[PDB]
């Protein structure tokens, strides 16, 4: 259903997100080769990939992650880590929508996450633009898992439209706001956002559509189970805003599913 | 380089060992189907397997585990859980011997795995005698990962001799005694020991061959990496008390390889 080529990119950014959690990237220097504990990012390891700037608890929300240069894949990857302790971070999630208009008219975006990027935007936007300058032939991708995901999406739609495309790969990201917004992220150019989800991952269930939230389109939904290897013949395009048969199926959800996107993610052996 | 039937048994007992850490298994009413959280033990979930005796923290060594009635596989399984933090248990690992002539004359063992077992030995011997009575033709199998492995092994060697074979499958087990214990465990009667190791796993290399400890033979080595699916082709039979060319290689150990035996084990998603 999804192309071998999209499958590799999905896999690779899953590893870049997982690397945000695992091995020597929580804080660190510049130029460092990227490596992960417990085989958590082999495809990144296999690439000529190097740190550009590493961050932590940046601004009001606690923003942690890195900016990488991948000479093999021709990339500049900004990766946002999610929470240190997920189950905590889960129950505490305020269903609250602050209007997004700067980013788009009539739109609505989650106060916690919406407020979280602004906190840091200028100090990193800068650091990206700089890299863009050095390798203007390189594709800018922002990725992230969980809280890291949400950030990426917010950093992305935000910082888009200054001349350089911004792809986003989110793995197990939650809703960031409203049906207008959703429609925005769906047709907004200069970056194709790829919202990846798994089975009944609890994160992209929240917040609910019952609370006026919605998700952008399409959604990429991994139907293979937890700990199960992923093949490109297990990933389905759920095109149509909030179409069902997706992470939005009617049924009951789970956390171990949040930790399995292609490989182990948001935790570290 | 092992048979298929052998592979399935490896895999089922890895799940059975996993379950000892994960699921609603830690204490539940007898007769309830055995289950786990985070896709830990699906082949055990597939079977008609219920708990017989549930325990945890019992013993003078906080010994944790379960006895399990498997109608589908026609087995009686006794499963021992490892430490809750394999690190604070690797770190704190005391290597002092003790006499174990009850098991085998001359043999000396780790005062720790011996004593925690000795304390639960009567009470658990009894409970297996009831299921063996209840099911004379069922296979008694003792299993465990990490510490669990070790205990299981020290149980097997000890309870063999009552008129029923006791097979042992340990996963990433530590070395358990001197050269006398080994040989007893390499050629002893009344049940086969299947000692499974993965790559550069750490615990099977402890305690050192230079604190008076040695390995039972044979060894079934898993060559596939951490977070990599296991095939019959990725297991290799390593022959010989303390042989090398498997796990017992002069290289640098790895905690995460210990946490992957056919699937996730030693931790829960």
Question: Between the CA atoms of A146, A188, A10 and A240, what dihedral angle is there, to the nearest 10 degrees?
Answer: 90
Out of A83, A167, A201, A215, the active site residue is A201
Question: Is cis: bond before A218, omega within 30 of 0?
Answer: yes
Return the residue matching tokens 């991708």.
Answer: A141
Out of A146, A170, A214, A217, the active site residue is A146
- Decide if A87 touches B, using CB distance below 8 A: no
B156 conformational bin, left if phi > 0, alpha if psi -120 to 50, beta if neither:
alpha
A35 Cβ contact list (under 8 Å, min separation 6) = A23, A24, A41, A45
Residue A201 among the catalytic residues: yes
Closest CA of chain A from B81, distance in Å:
18
Longest dimension (CA), chain B: 48
Task: Determine which of B18, B23, B37, B38 to mutate to test the interface with A (most A C-beta atoms within 10 Å).
Answer: B38
CB A195 within 8 A of CB A216: yes
A vs B: CB pairs below 8 A: 41
CB B231 within 8 A of CB B110: no
Nearest by CB: A227 against B255, B256, B263? B263
Q: Experimentally, how was this structure solved?
A: X-ray
- Decide if A259 touches B, using CB distance below 8 A: yes
Question: Between the CA atoms of B118, B124, B126 and B130, what dihedral angle is there, to the nearest 10 degrees?
Answer: -160
CB B128 within 8 A of CB B143: no
Nearest residue on chain A to B266, alpha-carbon basis: A269
Q: Which residues of A236-263 are buried (b: 16+ CB within 10 A; e: fewer)?
A: bebeebbeeebbbeeeebbbbbbbbbbb
Between chains, do B256 and A263 touch, taking CB under 8 Å as contact? Answer: no
Question: Between the CA atoms of A48, A52, A56 and A62, what dihedral angle is there, to the nearest 10 degrees?
Answer: -90
Question: Which residues 209-228 on chain B approach chain A with CB closer than 8 angstroms?
Answer: 225-228
DSSP annotation string for B68-119? EEETTTTEEEEEE---SSHHHHHTT----EEE-TTTSTT-EEEHHHHHHHHH
Distance CA B259, CA A39 (A): 12
**For B20, which DSSP code?**
T
CB A143 within 8 A of CB A176: no
Return the residue matching tokens 């009567």.
Answer: B122
Q: How many CB atoms sit inside 10 A of residue A93's CB?
A: 15
**Resolution of the structure in the document, Å:** 2.3
Q: How many CB atoms sit inside 10 A of residue B62's CB?
A: 13
Tokens of A4: 């071998």
Distance CA A47, CA A29 (A): 19
Nearest residue on chain A to B225, alpha-carbon basis: A39
Beta partners for residue B65, in sequence order: B55, B80
Distance CA B80, CA B102 (A): 21
CB A120 within 8 A of CB A63: yes
Between chains, do B38 and A227 touch, taking CB under 8 Å as contact? Answer: yes
Distance CA A64, CA B183 (A): 53
Q: Which residues of B34-44 are buried (b: 16+ CB within 10 A; e: fewer)?
A: bbbbbbbbbbb
Tokens of A27: 């804080």
CB B269 within 8 A of CB B43: no
Closest CA of chain A from B69, distance in Å:
26
Full strand arrangement of the beta sheet holding A219-222: A49-58, A63-70, A75-80, A139-145, A166-171, A193-198, A219-222, A235-238
What is the number of residues in chain B?
269
Between chains, do A38 and B259 touch, taking CB under 8 Å as contact? Answer: yes
Distance CA A96, CA A212 (A): 9
- Decide if A94 touches B, using CB distance below 8 A: no
Closest CA of chain A from B200, distance in Å:
12
> Which stretches of B92-217 are DSSP H helices?
111-134, 147-159, 179-187
- CA dihedral for A199, A201, A207, A208, sign (positive or negative): positive
Distance CA B46, CA A142 (A): 41
Distance CA B17, CA B40 (A): 10
Residue A146 among the catalytic residues: yes
Q: What CATH number does the domain located at B1-269 have?
A: 3.40.50.1820
Distance CA B204, CA A90 (A): 37
Closest CA of chain A from B197, distance in Å:
17
**For A254, which DSSP code?**
B
Distance CA B79, CA B178 (A): 24
CB B185 within 8 A of CB B119: no
Closest CA of chain A from B230, distance in Å:
11
Between chains, do B269 and A259 touch, taking CB under 8 Å as contact? Answer: yes
Task: Determine which of B87, B199, B223, B227 to mutate to test the interface with A (most A C-beta atoms within 10 Å).
Answer: B227
């Amino acid at each position: 259903e999804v192309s071998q080529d999209l499958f590799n990119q999905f896999n690779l950014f899953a590893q870049y997100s997982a690397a945000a959690y695992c091995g020597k990237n929580n804080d660190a220097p510049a130029g460092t080769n990227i490596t992960c504990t417990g085989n958590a990012c082999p495809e990144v390891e296999k690439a000529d990939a190097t740190f550009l700037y590493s961050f932590e608890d940046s601004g009001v929300g606690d923003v942690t992650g890195f900016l990488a240069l991948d000479n093999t894949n021709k990339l500049i990857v900004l990766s946002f880590r999610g929470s240190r302790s997920i189950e905590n971070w889960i129950g505490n999630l305020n269903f609250d929508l602050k209007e997004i208009n700067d980013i788009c008219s009539g739109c609505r975006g989650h106060d916690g996450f919406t407020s979280s990027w602004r906190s840091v935007a200028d100090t990193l936007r800068q650091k990206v633009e700089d890299a863009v300058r050095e390798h203007p032939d390189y594709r800018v991708v922002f990725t992230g898992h969980s809280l890291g995901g949400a950030l990426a999406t917010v950093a992305g739609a935000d910082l888009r439209g200054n001349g350089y495309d911004i792809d986003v790969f989110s793995y197990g990201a939650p809703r960031v706001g409203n049906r207008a917004f959703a429609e925005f992220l769906t047709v907004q150019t200069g970056g194709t956002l790829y919202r990846i989800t798994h089975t009944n991952d609890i994160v992209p269930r929240l917040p609910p559509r019952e609370f006026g939230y919605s998700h952008s389109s399409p959604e990429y939904w991994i139907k293979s189970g937890t700990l199960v290897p992923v093949t490109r013949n297990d990933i389905v395009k759920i095109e149509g805003i909030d179409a069902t048969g997706g992470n939005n199926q009617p049924n009951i959800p789970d956390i171990p599913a949040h930790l399995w996107y292609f490989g182990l993610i948001g935790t570290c052996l």
